[PDB]
Amino acid sequence: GSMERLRDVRERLQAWERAFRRQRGRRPSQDDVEAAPEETRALYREYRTLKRTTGQ
């Protein structure tokens, strides 16, 4: 179905958390969070809130 969206999102999330926890090594800040666009913000905050809350 959505190969372009899934590919972009999947890659965006992977790289995101990748370098994120690599340099940040902790919860993000309003500076980096508000730095990203709406779409990205939702995606990041989504996997971030789910991963942080859940703990998986």
Curated annotation (Swiss-Prot):
Instruction: Please list the residue ranges that the record marks as compositionally biased, kind Basic and acidic residues.
Output: 38-49
Tissue pattern of expression reads: Ubiquitously expressed, with highest levels in thymus and testis.
Phosphoserine modification sites?
S29
Q: Which residues form a coiled coil?
A: none
Provide the protein's localization.
Cytoplasm; Nucleus
Q: What induces it?
A: Up-regulated in actively dividing cells.
The superkingdom of the source organism is Eukaryota
Q: What does this protein do?
A: An ATP-dependent DNA helicase which unwinds dsDNA with a 3'-overhang in a 3'-5' direction. Does not unwind more than 18 bp of dsDNA. May modulate chromosome segregation. The N-terminal domain (residues 1-54) binds DNA Y-shaped DNA better than ss- or dsDNA. The core helicase domain binds ssDNA.
Please give the subunit comment from the record: Interacts with UBR1 and UBR2. Interacts with MCM10; this interaction regulates RECQL4 unwinding activity. Interacts (via residues 1-54) with TOPBP1.
Disease per record is: RAPADILINO syndrome: Disease characterized by radial and patellar aplasia or hypoplasia. Baller-Gerold syndrome: An autosomal recessive syndrome characterized by short stature, craniosynostosis, absent or hypoplastic radii, short and curved ulna, fused carpal bones and absent carpals, metacarpals and phalanges. Some patients manifest poikiloderma. Cases reported as Baller-Gerold syndrome have phenotypic overlap with several other disorders, including Saethre-Chotzen syndrome.
What's the family? Belongs to the helicase family. RecQ subfamily.
This chain's protein is named: ATP-dependent DNA helicase Q4
Record organism: Homo sapiens (Human)
Q: Which residues of the full protein are shown?
A: 1 to 54 of 1208
